[PDB]
Amino acid sequence: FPPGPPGLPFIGNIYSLAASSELPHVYMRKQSQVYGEIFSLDLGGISTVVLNGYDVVKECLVHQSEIFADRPCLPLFMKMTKMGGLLNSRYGRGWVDHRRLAVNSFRYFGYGQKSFESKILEETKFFNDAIETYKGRPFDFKQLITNAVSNITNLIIFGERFTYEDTDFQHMIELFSENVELAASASVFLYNAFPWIGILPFGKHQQLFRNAAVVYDFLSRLIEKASVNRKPQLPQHFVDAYLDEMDQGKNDPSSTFSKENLIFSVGELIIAGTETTTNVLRWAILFMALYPNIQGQVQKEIDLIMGPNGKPSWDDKCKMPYTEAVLHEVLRFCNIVPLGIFHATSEDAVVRGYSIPKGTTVITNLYSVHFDEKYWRDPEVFHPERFLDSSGYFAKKEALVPFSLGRRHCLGEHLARMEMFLFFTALLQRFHLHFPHELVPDLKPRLGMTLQPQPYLICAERRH
Ligand code: HEM
Ligand SMILES: C=C1CC[C@H](O)C/C1=C\C=C1\CCC[C@]2(C)[C@@H]([C@H](C)CCCC(C)C)CC[C@@H]12
């Protein structure tokens, strides 16, 4: 069983993570330098194993894919979803059924259709128009980016987009997003260690359970509004398709599709899309205002390939290596999902001599892969040029894994990439981005299951 740093009795390394000035993924990378690529932590009595660097992360999630495909049975995840749904589903027939349905649905109701790309572009127009509203005055992009990004998924799930005046839906996403953040909280690591803490009426765990209630109700209401006009066997979207599957499993009682599992799946798909993609864009914008020379080079490429008023296109990607370079270097350098989503072993495992008992939490420290000095030159530097080959084309790197690897890898990778590219290009084509009174902006990320920047104002002035 892998060695690791010691911590106090009862609470273990929750203390050492807690009392460290460094964020958890940074903490963990330093400890691998002392204990090895694979080390352990005692998180209040839950034994967890951390994987660090590209080699062991691959060795587990890819070479032993079925053994590390599971999710851990932490009290919070048992309470929230009973380990059904998709994202936190146990590895099994339930997960196979939901994953398959989701993959096919995103293909069929999404990027598999010729008209889909223009629906993204339609959204960049609402988005850019909303930006113009402010007439170059400083504001926070967080809301608009969130609205716009979530609508690309709303099309696939609910068959429609919600307007930017829809503050009810926005409120539901703000609570759900708070929950993704509180999930990384010391309060929650303790709650999972000591679930009797649930008797305590105050604290971040009660905020999370309350939020989850409000969110669960809202999602079931949306799912009901989206199933009104349903024509059995002729689905308009993911919700209809899910209901199709419940029909075909009415006689199969071991069928895993359920009304509860539909709310969990929809919630998981919606929050997975909105949290992550939004943040990528928010980091990118931050860095383009910080480094105008880099912003300007992207803009130069846009004008050469797309012109001043051309509609951006997914097909343009491969004529725009520098743009693709910047975007990949944001994924690598900001690590929007720094520790991925926790895994667990689906059976007793043996990795590099160490034994890992069935059910152990396994943390894949994706941050440490992107800063693995065996595969990256000076990874502590933001430098898009590292993704360019000697002819100036985009050069893909094996050790860039911001959508993780193996059986559980991001289901939305492709969709995210189109969203990112089309939103970033549409925005930079129309605007110049800089800070107010050249304010000194903060680049220290906010502690959560995803990394987002602190609130920052930005000025968007039209270019032509
Ligand atoms: C920049 C955008 C995104 C990033 C960086 C990202 C990252 C990730 C990561 C690191 C995982 C962990 C997989 C694991 O357990 O090892 C994941 C899983 C997942 N992602 Fe994404 N994601 C993004 C966008 C999306 C979008 C747009 C969707 C859906 C529309 C999505 C849906 C999911 C789902 C459902 C899972 C769980 C898959 C499973 O458990 O089988 N993600 N994502
Ligand atoms: C769906 C439903 C159904 C609706 C309920 O309110 C609860 C719920 C999800 C709850 C959570 C809270 C805990 C943290 C979870 C389990 C997130 C998980 C830690 C992954 C977050 C990282 C991801 C955005 C990359 C995803 C869903 C989150």
UniProtKB/Swiss-Prot annotation:
It comes from the Eukaryota. One of its GO terms (molecular function) is heme binding. It is an enzyme of class 1 (oxidoreductase). Its main location: endoplasmic reticulum. Coiled coil: none annotated. Pathway: Hormone biosynthesis; vitamin D biosynthesis. It is a peripheral membrane protein. Heme binds at residue 410. It is found in: Endoplasmic reticulum membrane; Microsome membrane. A cytochrome P450 monooxygenase involved in activation of vitamin D precursors. Can metabolize vitamin D analogs/prodrugs 1alpha-hydroxyvitamin D(2) (doxercalciferol) and 1alpha-hydroxyvitamin D(3) (alfacalcidol) forming 25-hydroxy derivatives. Mechanistically, uses molecular oxygen inserting one oxygen atom into a substrate, and reducing the second into a water molecule, with two electrons provided by NADPH via cytochrome P450 reductase (CPR; NADPH-ferrihemoprotein reductase). This is Vitamin D 25-hydroxylase. It comes from Homo sapiens. The gene is CYP2R1.
